[PDB]
Amino acid sequence: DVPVNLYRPNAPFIGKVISNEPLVKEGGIGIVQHIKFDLTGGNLKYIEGQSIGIIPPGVDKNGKPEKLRLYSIASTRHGDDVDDKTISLCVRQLEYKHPESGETVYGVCSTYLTHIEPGSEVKITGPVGKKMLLPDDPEANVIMLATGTGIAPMRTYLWRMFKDAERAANPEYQFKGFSWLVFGVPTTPNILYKEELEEIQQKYPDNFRLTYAISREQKNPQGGRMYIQDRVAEHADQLWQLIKNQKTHTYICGLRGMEEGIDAALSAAAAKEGVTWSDYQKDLKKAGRWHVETY
Numbered sequence: 653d654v655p656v657n658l659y660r661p662n663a664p665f666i667g668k669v670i671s672n673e674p675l676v677k678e679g680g681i682g683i684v685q686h687i688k689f690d691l692t693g694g695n696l697k698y699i700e701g702q703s704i705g706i707i708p709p710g711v712d713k714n715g716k717p718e719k720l721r722l723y724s725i726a727s728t729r730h731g732d733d734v735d736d737k738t739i740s741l742c743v744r745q746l747e748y749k750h751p752e753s754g755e756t757v758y759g760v761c762s763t764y765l766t767h768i769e770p771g772s773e774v775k776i777t778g779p780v781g782k783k784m785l786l787p788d789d790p791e792a793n794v795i796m797l798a799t800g801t802g803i804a805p806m807r808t809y810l811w812r813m814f815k816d817a818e819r820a821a822n823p824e825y826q827f828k829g830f831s832w833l834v835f836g837v838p839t840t841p842n843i844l845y846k847e848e849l850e851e852i853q854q855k856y857p858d859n860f861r862l863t864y865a866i867s868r869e870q871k872n873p874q875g876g877r878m879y880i881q882d883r884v885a886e887h888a889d890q891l892w893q894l895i896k897n898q899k900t901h902t903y904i905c906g907l908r909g910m911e912e913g914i915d916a917a918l919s920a921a922a923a924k925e926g927v928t929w930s931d932y933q934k935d936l937k938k939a940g941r942w943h944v945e946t947y
C-alpha cells in the first residue's frame with residue numbers, strides 16, 4: 653500500500669521545477685531552499701516520511717556519470733497546494749573546507765538544486781523509505797527531534813496534521829494527539845518554516861509544542877552553545893514519560909551526530925525508574941515506534 657520505487661534511476665521521472673524559494677533569511681548561515689517539482693505527466697505518488705532521488709547532471713572527477721542523491725520529501729502526499737500534482741524538497745547547499753583539495757568545496761547535487769531555475773527538468777526517482785512513516789492513529793503522540801534539513805519529514809507530519817486544507821482533504825486523519833518539535837539551527841533566520849511553525853502552534857496550543865535550540869543565540873546550563881541534545885536533556889523527564897505511552901512515536905532526522913546526546917539524556921531519565929533506555933529503545937525499534945534517519 654505504501655508507494656515505493658515507482659521510478660528507478662535507469663528510467664527516472666523527468667519532472668519540472670515550478671518554484672525555488674529561499675528558507676534562510678538575512679543574517680543566517682548558508683543556503684537552504686524550498687524547491688517544488690511538477691509531477692504531472694507521470695505517476696509518482698508518495699506519503700509522509702519518504703525520500704526521493706535526484707540525479708544531478710554531469711560527470712565526477714573520474715569521468716563517471718553522477719549518481720542519485722536522496723532528499724527527504726518536504727511535502728505531504730498532496731503537495732504544498734493540496735492538489736496532488738507536485739512534490740517539494742528542502743535542500744541545503746553543502747560547502748566545506750580547504751583540506752579537501754581547493755578552498756571552499758561545493759556539493760554537486762545540492763548546489764545544482766539550490767540554484768536550479770523554474771522551468772528546468774529534473775531526474776527524480778522513488779519514493780523510497782519505510783523507516784519514517786507516520787501512524788494513521790489520530791490519537792498518536794509524535795515527538796520530533798530535528799536539526800537543519802531534518803525538518804523536512806517533520807514538515808510533512810505537521811502539515812498533514814494541522815493545515816486547514818489538509819484536514820479538509822483527509823476526513824480520516826483529524827489529529828487530536830500531542831506533537832512536540834525540538835528544532836536545532838544556528839540562528840533565528842535559519843529557522844526554516846518559522847512563520848508556519850509558529851502559526852501552527854497558535855492554532856493548536858494544546859496539540860503542538862514548538863521548542864527551539866539556537867546555538868548562536870542560546871547557551872545551555874554549562875555555558876556552551878545550545879543544541880537539540882541540550883533541550884532534550886532539559887526536558888528529559890517529560891520526554892521519557894511521553895515515550896512510555898503505547899501510542900507515542902519518536903522521529904529523529906538531520907545530519908549525523910545528534911543521537912548520542914539524545915540517548916544519554918533519556919538514559920538518565922529512564923534510569924530513575926529502573927529502566928535501561930538502550931534496551932527499552934530496542935523494543936521501540938522493533939515496535940516501529942523509534943524512527944531515525946540521519947545522514
Ligand SMILES: Cc1cc2nc3c(=O)[nH]c(=O)nc-3n(C[C@H](O)[C@H](O)[C@H](O)COP(=O)(O)OP(=O)(O)OC[C@H]3O[C@@H](n4cnc5c(N)ncnc54)[C@H](O)[C@@H]3O)c2cc1C
Nearest residue numbers: 721722723724742743744746748759760761762801804947
Ligand atoms: C535519506 C536521506 C535524506 C536526506 N535528506 C536531505 C534533505 O532533506 N535535505 C538536504 O539538504 N540533504 C539531505 N540529505 C543529504 C543529501 O543526500 C546529499 O548527501 C547532500 O545534499 C550532499 O550532496 P551533494 O551532491 O551536494 O554533495 P557530494 O558532492 O557528494 O559531496 C559530499 C561528499 O563530500 C564529502 N563531504 C561532505 N561534507 C564534508 C565536510 N564537512 N568535510 C569534509 N568532507 C565533506 C564526503 O566525501 C561526501 O560524500 C539526505 C540524505 C539521505 C541519505
